[PDB]
Amino acid sequence: CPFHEVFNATRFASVYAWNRTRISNCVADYSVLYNFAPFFAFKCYGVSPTKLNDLCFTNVYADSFVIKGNEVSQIAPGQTGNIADYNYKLPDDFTGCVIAWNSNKLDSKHSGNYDYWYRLFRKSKLKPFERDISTEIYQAGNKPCKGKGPNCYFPLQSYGFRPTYGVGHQPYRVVVLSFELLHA
Amino acid sequence: STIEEQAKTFLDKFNHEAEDLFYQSSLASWNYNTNITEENVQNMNNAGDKWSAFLKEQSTLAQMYPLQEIQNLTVKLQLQALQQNGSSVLSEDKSKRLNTILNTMSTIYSTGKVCNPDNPQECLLLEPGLNEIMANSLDYNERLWAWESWRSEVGKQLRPLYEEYVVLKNEMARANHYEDYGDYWRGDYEVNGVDGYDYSRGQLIEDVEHTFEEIKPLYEHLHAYVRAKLMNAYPSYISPIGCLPAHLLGDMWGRFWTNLYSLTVPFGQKPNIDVTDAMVDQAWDAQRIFKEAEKFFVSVGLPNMTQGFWENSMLTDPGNVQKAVCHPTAWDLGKGDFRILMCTKVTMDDFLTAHHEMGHIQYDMAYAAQPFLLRNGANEGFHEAVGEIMSLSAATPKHLKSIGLLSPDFQEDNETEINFLLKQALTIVGTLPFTYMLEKWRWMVFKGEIPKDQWMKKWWEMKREIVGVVEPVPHDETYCDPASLFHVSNDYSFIRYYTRTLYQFQFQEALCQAAKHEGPLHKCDISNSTEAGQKLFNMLRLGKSEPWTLALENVVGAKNMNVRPLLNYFEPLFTWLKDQNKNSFVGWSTDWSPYA
Ligand SMILES: *[C@@H]1O[C@H](CO)[C@@H](O[C@@H]2O[C@H](CO)[C@@H](O[C@@H]3O[C@H](CO)[C@@H](O)[C@H](O)[C@@H]3O)[C@H](O)[C@H]2NC(C)=O)[C@H](O)[C@H]1NC(C)=O
Ligand SMILES: *[C@@H]1O[C@H](CO)[C@@H](O[C@@H]2O[C@H](CO)[C@@H](O[C@@H]3O[C@H](CO)[C@@H](O)[C@H](O)[C@@H]3O)[C@H](O)[C@H]2NC(C)=O)[C@H](O)[C@H]1NC(C)=O
Ligand SMILES: *[C@@H]1O[C@H](CO)[C@@H](O[C@@H]2O[C@H](CO)[C@@H](O)[C@H](O)[C@H]2NC(C)=O)[C@H](O)[C@H]1NC(C)=O
Ligand SMILES: *[C@@H]1O[C@H](CO)[C@@H](O)[C@H](O)[C@H]1NC(C)=O
Numbered sequence: 161c162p163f164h165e166v167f168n169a170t171r172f173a174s175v176y177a178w179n180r181t182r183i184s185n186c187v188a189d190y191s192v193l194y195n196f197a198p199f200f201a202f203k204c205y206g207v208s209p210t211k212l213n214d215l216c217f218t219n220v221y222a223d224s225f226v227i228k229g230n231e232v233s234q235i236a237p238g239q240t241g242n243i244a245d246y247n248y249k250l251p252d253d254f255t256g257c258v259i260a261w262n263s264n265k266l267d268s269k270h271s272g273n274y275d276y277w278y279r280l281f282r283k284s285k286l287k288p289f290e291r292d293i294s295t296e297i298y299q300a301g302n303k304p305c306k307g308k309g310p311n312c313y314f315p316l317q318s319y320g321f322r323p324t325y326g327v328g329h330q331p332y333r334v335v336v337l338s339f340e341l342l343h344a
Numbered sequence: 345s346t347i348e349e350q351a352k353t354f355l356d357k358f359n360h361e362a363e364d365l366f367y368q369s370s371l372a373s374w375n376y377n378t379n380i381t382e383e384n385v386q387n388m389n390n391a392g393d394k395w396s397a398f399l400k401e402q403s404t405l406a407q408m409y410p411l412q413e414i415q416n417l418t419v420k421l422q423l424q425a426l427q428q429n430g431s432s433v434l435s436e437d438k439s440k441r442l443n444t445i446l447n448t449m450s451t452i453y454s455t456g457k458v459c460n461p462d463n464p465q466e467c468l469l470l471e472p473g474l475n476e477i478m479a480n481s482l483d484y485n486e487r488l489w490a491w492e493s494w495r496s497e498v499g500k501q502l503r504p505l506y507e508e509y510v511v512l513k514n515e516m517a518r519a520n521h522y523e524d525y526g527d528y529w530r531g532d533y534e535v536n537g538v539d540g541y542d543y544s545r546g547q548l549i550e551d552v553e554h555t556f557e558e559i560k561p562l563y564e565h566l567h568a569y570v571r572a573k574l575m576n577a578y579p580s581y582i583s584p585i586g587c588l589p590a591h592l593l594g595d596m597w598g599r600f601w602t603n604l605y606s607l608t609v610p611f612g613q614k615p616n617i618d619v620t621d622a623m624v625d626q627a628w629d630a631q632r633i634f635k636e637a638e639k640f641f642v643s644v645g646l647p648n649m650t651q652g653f654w655e656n657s658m659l660t661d662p663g664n665v666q667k668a669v670c671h672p673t674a675w676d677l678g679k680g681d682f683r684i685l686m687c688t689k690v691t692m693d694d695f696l697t698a699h700h701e702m703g704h705i706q707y708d709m710a711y712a713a714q715p716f717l718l719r720n721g722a723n724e725g726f727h728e729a730v731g732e733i734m735s736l737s738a739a740t741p742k743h744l745k746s747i748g749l750l751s752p753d754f755q756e757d758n759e760t761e762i763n764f765l766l767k768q769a770l771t772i773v774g775t776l777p778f779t780y781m782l783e784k785w786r787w788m789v790f791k792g793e794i795p796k797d798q799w800m801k802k803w804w805e806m807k808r809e810i811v812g813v814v815e816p817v818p819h820d821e822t823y824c825d826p827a828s829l830f831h832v833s834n835d836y837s838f839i840r841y842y843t844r845t846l847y848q849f850q851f852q853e854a855l856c857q858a859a860k861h862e863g864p865l866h867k868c869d870i871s872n873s874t875e876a877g878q879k880l881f882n883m884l885r886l887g888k889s890e891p892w893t894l895a896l897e898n899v900v901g902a903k904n905m906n907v908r909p910l911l912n913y914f915e916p917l918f919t920w921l922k923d924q925n926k927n928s929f930v931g932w933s934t935d936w937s938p939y940a
């Protein structure tokens with residue numbers, strides 16, 4: 161089954177444009193990823209893995225995130241913050257597993273990895289499993305807006321990952337395996 | 345649709361832009377500091393120019409939001425930091441003139457040298473050179489020659505520049521809705537808003553006067569003892585009741601009195617504590633010193649160093665291959681990057697400097713969670729005080745005996761304690777009047793009570809009345825004596841040191857009381873005392889988000905500056921001085937002058 165293309169790729173997607181990777185039509189063998197990829201984060205809020213043999217998945221979804229260090233705690237049910245409210249929101253009844261791992265050796269650069277973006281401003285809150293690609297400028301004042309300049313601001317901002325950052329600022333490749341058990 | 349929401353969004357954008365820009369600038373600066381190479385200078389210049397341009401561009405857009413329509417007391421501080429017109433209130437030509445005058449003053453101070461008479465081919469700089477003469481000479485004529493020379497060559501090339509500097513700075517200060525530039529600096533201690541913790545800009549002067557009115561007896565006794573002891577080295581140059589000449593204080597300006605220990609030691613037969621031989625005999629390195637400092641810091645419950653600090657921070661001099669600047673400094677590059685830059689040697693002085701720098705790093709690491717604009721100390725005095733409390737606490741004989749660097753059978757006597765107390769006093773107590781007088785003179789000059797033609801007539805007049813030092817030769821209005829200092833020729837404040845010195849002993853007393861210590865304060869170690877660390881943490885993580893009065897009250901228990909702990913720390917020395925000088929005279933008269 162394809163897990164090699166899902167976990168061992170050169171490039172992933174930004175959190176604002178997170179890839180809802182489709183996994184289907186194969187046999188679940190991710191125990192090698194236990195040893196090949198030492199997942200430091202592994203939180204399962206749904207059923208126990210030991211029950212996974214009773215019910216399998218066909219139309220299961222997977223998510224690929226590239227986010228900061230002091231943010232994996234924000235990817236949890238009932239949590240709040242910038243990313244949870246504007247970028248990716250999980251439902252309260254979330255049955256899935258969050259997995260994260262450090263990616264200094266392949267997602268950091270001396271000049272700066274200016275290829276991963278994240279939403280900052282939006283005139284609303286998000287709902288579970290919603291994706292936004294809009295690039296229209298954000299309004300902050302009463303006057304109508306055409307272009308940047310005054311209070312109006314662009315809605316997207318990029319990261320500045322470097323290999324010599326601290327533990328809380330180094331990029332974490334975060335597979336939020338929000339694999340939906342109810343839908344498959 | 346309101347103003348508060350728009351201000352919140354504006355600060356949100358600025359917070360994310362400034363982090364990246366500042367990190368780039370700091371990394372470039374560190375890379376320059378490691379080497380000495382042209383391309384590093386080019387990169388540093390480019391990064392600094394970009395950061396300054398971004399800050400200037402962002403400053404203009406922040407004035408659109410009125411300060412009176414926002415009631416949050418947290419975003420208001422950040423906006424007040426940002427809404428400040430720096431030097432753009434005046435016209436472009438005036439700003440160019442101010443930048444030129446500052447650069448000229450700095451260049452004149454930096455590259456000043458004096459040549460011995462009739463020997464044009466032999467000229468000495470300030471460092472090395474005149475400093476060695478000031479710190480390690482027992483002669484009389486040479487010290488006076490150097491003291492008069494340095495000022496004669498430097499100050500007259502700075503006074504006319506300083507007049508225009510003062511005029512333009514006053515113009516800018518009045519354009520910024522202030523009273524003068526002295527009020528501009530006093531505004532750092534200003535607190536407005538929440539009731540019960542207000543601190544007007546004018547309260548600082550009264551507080552400093554009241555606090556200094558209590559230190560006078562101890563300083564009087566110390567001055568009398570020093571004057572009595574120095575009559576043995578300069579038998580025919582010191583008045584029995586007069587003031588001490590300023591050229592015999594072991595320093596160019598008299599800021600510290602440390603270099604007089606070899607002349608005023610009470611018991612010269614009994615040696616002091618020096619563990620250098622113990623350091624050598626056990627094959628100690630810089631890594632061992634740093635790990636011992638880390639062990640000391642963790643003994644009180646504080647966190648320890650990040651892994652990256654052990655990799656990106658250099659500890660020893662690379663050698664002739666590279667060329668670095670050996671100067672201890674704690675670097676906070678942001679985004680979780682903390683480094684230490686110091687060339688370490690096996691010596692007790694480095695053993696204490698490591699503790700000072702690691703305290704710096706701990707304080708910097710404490711407030712990493714606050715927003716970018718609030719990532720600093722409560723005021724300009726907390727930082728070095730937090731650094732120095734550890735250095736004072738780590739030099740106790742009990743700690744040295746506990747770590748095995750001293751012989752367990754060394755019977756500590758009540759005679760070495762006097763020596764240690766005197767050595768500490770000569771460098772702590774003897775600098776407060778100098779700082780206080782310099783700041784008072786600067787404030788009086790900026791305010792306007794002293795006309796342009798009556799500057800020096802006050803400058804030497806205050807000395808005789810406060811510090812007890814007299815000029816060896818007369819001076820006229822052409823000289824500019826204060827500008828000879830680094831902090832006066834270059835635009836720098838000077839009231840930091842007085843507040844830091846008063847805060848450090850108060851914090852030490854609070855921690856020692858919280859540590860269940862029995863005995864004199866000078867024999868206090870905060871090691872193995874969790875209660876002595878957690879309390880300090882309550883101040884470490886606040887940062888600038890709260891008024892400094894509340895931060896001070898959270899540890900000591902009082903919301904105002906106090907001096908009683910400082911005098912309590914020196915009680916046995918005070919008693920010994922009182923007993924010793926019963927046959928001498930305390931006090932000085934402002935009539936005796938060496939030149940008349
Ligand atoms: C002045 O503005 C600051 C923010 O600029 C306000 O501080 C903020 O206060 C809110 C509460 O109203 C904090 O929200 C937090 O939300 C989480 C969500 O789970 C909740 O668990 C917390 O208990 C808390 O309510 C927010 O973190 C905090 N932010 C900061 C930077 O302090 C402050 O309240 C304003 N002043 C007044 C008087 O309202
Ligand atoms: C220093 O900061 C102050 C604000 O704290 C800036 O003052 C503002 O300056 C602008 C331009 O001079 C003023 O706009 C003009 O106001 C007049 C009178 O209301 C109006 O007739 C013009 O059409 C124009 O709008 C603005 O009112 C003024 N605001 C305040 C509160 O003083 C000042 O420009 C800054 N100085 C710099 C950046 O050099
Ligand atoms: C702080 O506490 C530690 C732990 O008690 C002290 O280290 C001990 O010192 C005694 C000296 O008699 C040794 O017998 C123990 O073996 C040491 N502990 C360990 C774990 O080795 C330390 O000396 C104390 N520091 C101060 C300054 O009192
Ligand atoms: C992952 O990719 C690396 C580099 O191509 C390769 O050496 C390694 O064997 C791969 N492991 C997996 C998951 O197949």
Ligand SMILES: *[C@@H]1O[C@H](CO)[C@@H](O)[C@H](O)[C@H]1NC(C)=O
Nearest residue numbers: 165166173178179180181182
């Ligand atoms: C998502 O991942 C799938 C499977 O690797 C890939 O085929 C597809 O191109 C990706 N899409 C995006 C938007 O990255």
Ligand SMILES: *[C@@H]1O[C@H](CO)[C@@H](O)[C@H](O)[C@H]1NC(C)=O
Nearest residue numbers: 375376378379381384665666
């Ligand atoms: C420092 O200088 C050496 C040689 O002078 C060079 O090899 C090295 O790359 C330089 N490093 C930095 C950070 O400038």
Ligand SMILES: *[C@@H]1O[C@H](CO)[C@@H](O)[C@H](O)[C@H]1NC(C)=O
Nearest residue numbers: 638639642645646647648649
């Ligand atoms: C102190 O440093 C040691 C050495 O790595 C570490 O094991 C310990 O966790 C540190 N203490 C704290 C409170 O971080």
Ligand SMILES: *[C@@H]1O[C@H](CO)[C@@H](O)[C@H](O)[C@H]1NC(C)=O
Nearest residue numbers: 610611757758759760762920
């Ligand atoms: C130390 O104690 C002795 C006790 O015999 C006493 O005579 C002496 O005055 C004390 N002080 C000094 C400085 O020796």
Ligand SMILES: [Zn+2]
Nearest residue numbers: 700704728731
């Ligand atoms: Zn320091």
